Design a binder for these strands. Structure first.
Ligand SMILES: Nc1ncnc2c1ncn2[C@@H]1O[C@H](CSCC[C@H](N)C(=O)O)[C@@H](O)[C@H]1O
Ligand SMILES: Nc1ncnc2c1ncn2[C@@H]1O[C@H](CSCC[C@H](N)C(=O)O)[C@@H](O)[C@H]1O
Lengths: 283, 188, 283, 187
DNA sequence: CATGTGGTCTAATTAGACCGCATG
DNA sequence: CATGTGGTCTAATTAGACCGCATG
């Protein structure tokens, strides 16, 4: 009947995809990831017990690699948004610098895409920021031949995260509803003795200034009467990752907030991956 | 191969530079043709696959990086990526095979990393056509193409591009269009 | 007829004593800790659900404080050894620097000792290093009126940790044995895909060079071909602490290693605290 | 208080310094007694509680820190800590109520930190006794004691201890004096 | 007007190199 | 002879202040 799912993960980072597929019961046969930061590779290799195959730089994978490693049923991707987000002033755009890496994703997608005679199921998803210039968005849409759906994590987590998602998954525009296990408020993610001055927080970048909310940059936590910033475990709880999911490779708060700031929201990707349980085998 | 009386007039799609004034010199286009077997578009940012399919079937797709200095609100990589997109839009169905060709030429506008992304997205290494006059090279192009169409080092080309910042070398590439005479009809 | 235990922990640090008592199933009515390092207090407060009372510096604790907070059934102590250990070339001895803090223990101990009419059981324990000058050990024994038992943690863990223990706990001289859960080799504490070059590890301190074993300063773990230092979770496994027990307060690697290098060995203190189940109420 | 014919000679234990030739000069010990009912040990490093208990029951224990010309083999705090450790041995059982006294005197060799440690371990603030000659302080001492026995600011004492770095038993004998109402007065 | 999957620069901040010698 | 609940010094390493403007 139903068969396990074969995934090709692009700019995988901390392997949020595999984690969602696992938490969903979907049985995974292959999970080929392309990642270059050794810390993220360590996260993925430890927290999933070496079930993920890593393929290194995206610009060194050929069509022969896609055919041999293939066939693939799912292709996830989220390219670097360093030259695309409008928070960086020196941003170079989609056709210069990090943005160009998007065209690698594209290049592989049409490689792994089934031919016009093969009616096999094949799914794909690409994610990037909303805070990009409209030209970058329209060009990404043109190359993907799809218009995006904008999802903010504030409906399912305790933080804002407006992100654009292109793809063909079932019901990508279906209404987003919250689950009973989702921590909607900041207090639901905090630790003992800590109090949330806020109920929802802003978007969390890889930088420290994002952890201080408001135009006046206020601290979010109060502990023993003092103003304190968020802890790493609470960031993991906000994003939806399991607790101590990023506690590897002797990483301090810098590398951990960096890896989490480039990542996805676990409940959002759970929502977007949920319909796949009807096409593929479930554990 | 196709016989002479069954050869059809070729239908081409020029993507950045207009080769009509040059292809008409090789007898692939009639000087007067309101049907216009060549489709030329210069700002392809708003083009959808349905536009390419509605414009009609194409036997050849041509693109070129703007000649040295003649740039405008676009990097060199933009032309390569857009050419790849539109070529994928125009390539015929594999289950309905037909003579199909494409070409992309650079006038030393792409640097090394752009050269690598070009060779990766076009799946071949370029050929370097030189213009040697008086034993000295004056201009040169790089061509990626699937048509079965003098040696000099990369250092000479780099110094040539360095000096020639202070122009279209269509004559060099024209020969590369000659092998297309056997598949499509030859005007007088 | 057994009653919950009432504890007084001087220099509590990572609150190891509470962890050991609650792992042995002993009901604790009152646990008063005297710690100054805010990060240690954070570990103890978060990981034990605020069931611990902190009373700041031991030098500001008066006999009236002992009578108010008391009576006490257990006294626990481990004073700073930076001036007692021989690894420090600028050690100041037992009567200068941090060594004087020992005499605070002594003081509070005499304040918490029951009257001779009180047949109520009263237990106490003091821990310090083996690598101290013989005069300092002599004087500690003189002031405590008993000789110490020497215990090395290699019998129950994967690292060397030679420590002197003064006290009157039942059977402190009985032979030490390793339970099934005692991770004896270094390979048992390592993460996925990381292999141990050594079977046992040298004594781990707050300083980083303690991780580099041997006179050649050889790394103890290899991964993907290259040598690497021990991770914080692996250190927590070595000392017997639960995983991510010290993952609080946005602490980097150095702070965690400091905290763990000052603390005790969990299985050693479990061995020492096991007899108290026969006198006090178990859960 | 106790009647005079029932007053007994006081058994005293002098630590670090010797109060003989001073208390005997006051009338608490006879000069001829070879045992002298006084115990004196200068190096208390290897003294056990059983040693103190065997050395006889004591009515008074005394300790003093060596003056600016100290033995300087031990820190000034060693004397205080060892005095505490031994006094805790020499005290009588609660069920044996008896007149028991103690005294520790510092000759300005302790630092303010060690002063606080001393006041913490001895459970009281000291009393500074001054030697005033020609309206000018010459020497001074600090005393902690439980015996029911001229003002100077700590800056005079600070500059004094700073200059005099280049034994005021007389100042302390007055503090011993109130012990007459409990023990025998020798002629 | 508030905001933002960021880069730069520089002041703290941290970590590795160095040193250290009393005891089984 | 090897080792060690370390301290110091200096070279990296990191983190906070600063800046930035296109889109709802
Ligand atoms: N050339 C390249 N090849 C492969 N991965 C690359 C790359 N350049 C950057 N990356 C990786 O691409 C990632 C983009 S950040 C996106 C992470 C992912 N969306 C998540 O949820 O974790 C980064 O982790 C970066 O290390
Ligand atoms: N004056 C003081 N009062 C109380 N605690 C103090 C102190 N000076 C130092 N300390 C604390 O005493 C601890 C000694 S290290 C021993 C830690 C503890 N035995 C454990 O197993 O975790 C240190 O954590 C230090 O922060």
């Amino acid at each position: 009947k139903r068969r396990p799912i074969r995934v090709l993960s692009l700019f995988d980072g901390i392997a949020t995809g595999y984690l969602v597929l696992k938490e969903l019961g979907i049985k995974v046969e292959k999970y080929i990831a392309s990642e270059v930061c050794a810390e993220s590779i360590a996260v993925g290799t430890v927290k999933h017990e070496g079930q993920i195959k890593y393929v290194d730089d995206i610009r060194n994978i050929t069509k022969e690699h896609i055919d041999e490693w293939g066939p693939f049923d799912l292709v996830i991707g989220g390219s670097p948004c360093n030259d695309l987000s409008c928070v960086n002033p020196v941003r170079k755009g989609l056709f210069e610098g990090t943005g160009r890496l998007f065209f690698e994703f594209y290049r592989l997608l049409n490689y792994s895409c089934p031919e016009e005679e093969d009616d096999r199921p094949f799914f794909w998803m690409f994610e990037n920021v909303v805070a990009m210039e409209v030209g970058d968005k329209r060009d990404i849409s043109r190359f993907l031949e799809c218009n995006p759906v904008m999802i903010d994590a504030i409906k399912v987590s305790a933080a804002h995260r407006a992100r654009y998602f292109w793809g063909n998954l079932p019901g990508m525009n279906r209404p987003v509803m919250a689950s009973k296990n989702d921590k909607l408020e900041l207090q639901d993610c905090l630790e003992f003795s800590r109090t949330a001055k806020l109920k929802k927080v802003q978007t969390i970048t890889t930088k420290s200034n994002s952890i201080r909310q408001g135009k006046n940059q206020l601290f979010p936590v109060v502990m023993n009467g003092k103003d304190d910033v968020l802890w790493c475990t609470e960031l993991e709880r906000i994003f939806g990752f399991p607790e101590h999911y990023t506690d590897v490779s002797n990483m301090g708060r810098g590398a951990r907030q960096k890896l989490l700031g480039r990542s996805w929201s676990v409940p959002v990707i759970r929502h977007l991956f949920a319909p796949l349980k009807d096409h593929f085998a479930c554990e | 191969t196709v016989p002479v009386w069954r050869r059809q007039p070729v239908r081409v799609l020029s993507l950045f530079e207009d080769i009509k004034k040059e292809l008409t010199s090789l007898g692939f286009l009639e000087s007067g043709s309101d049907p216009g077997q060549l489709k030329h578009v210069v700002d392809v940012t708003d083009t959808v696959r349905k536009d390419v399919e509605e414009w009609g079937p194409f036997d050849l797709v041509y693109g070129a990086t703007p000649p040295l200095g003649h740039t405008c609100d676009r990097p060199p990589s933009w032309y390569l990526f857009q050419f790849h997109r539109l070529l994928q839009y125009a390539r015929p169905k594999p289950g309905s095979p037909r003579p199909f060709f494409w070409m992309f030429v650079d006038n030393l506008v792409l640097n090394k990393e752009d050269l690598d992304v070009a060779s990766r997205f076009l799946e071949m290494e370029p050929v370097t056509i030189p213009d040697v006059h008086g034993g000295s090279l004056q201009n040169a192009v790089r061509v990626w193409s699937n048509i079965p169409a003098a040696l000099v080092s990369e250092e000479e080309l780099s110094l040539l591009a360095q000096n020639k910042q202070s122009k279209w070398p269509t004559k060099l590439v024209k020969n590369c269009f000659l092998p297309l005479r056997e598949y499509f009809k030859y005007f007088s």
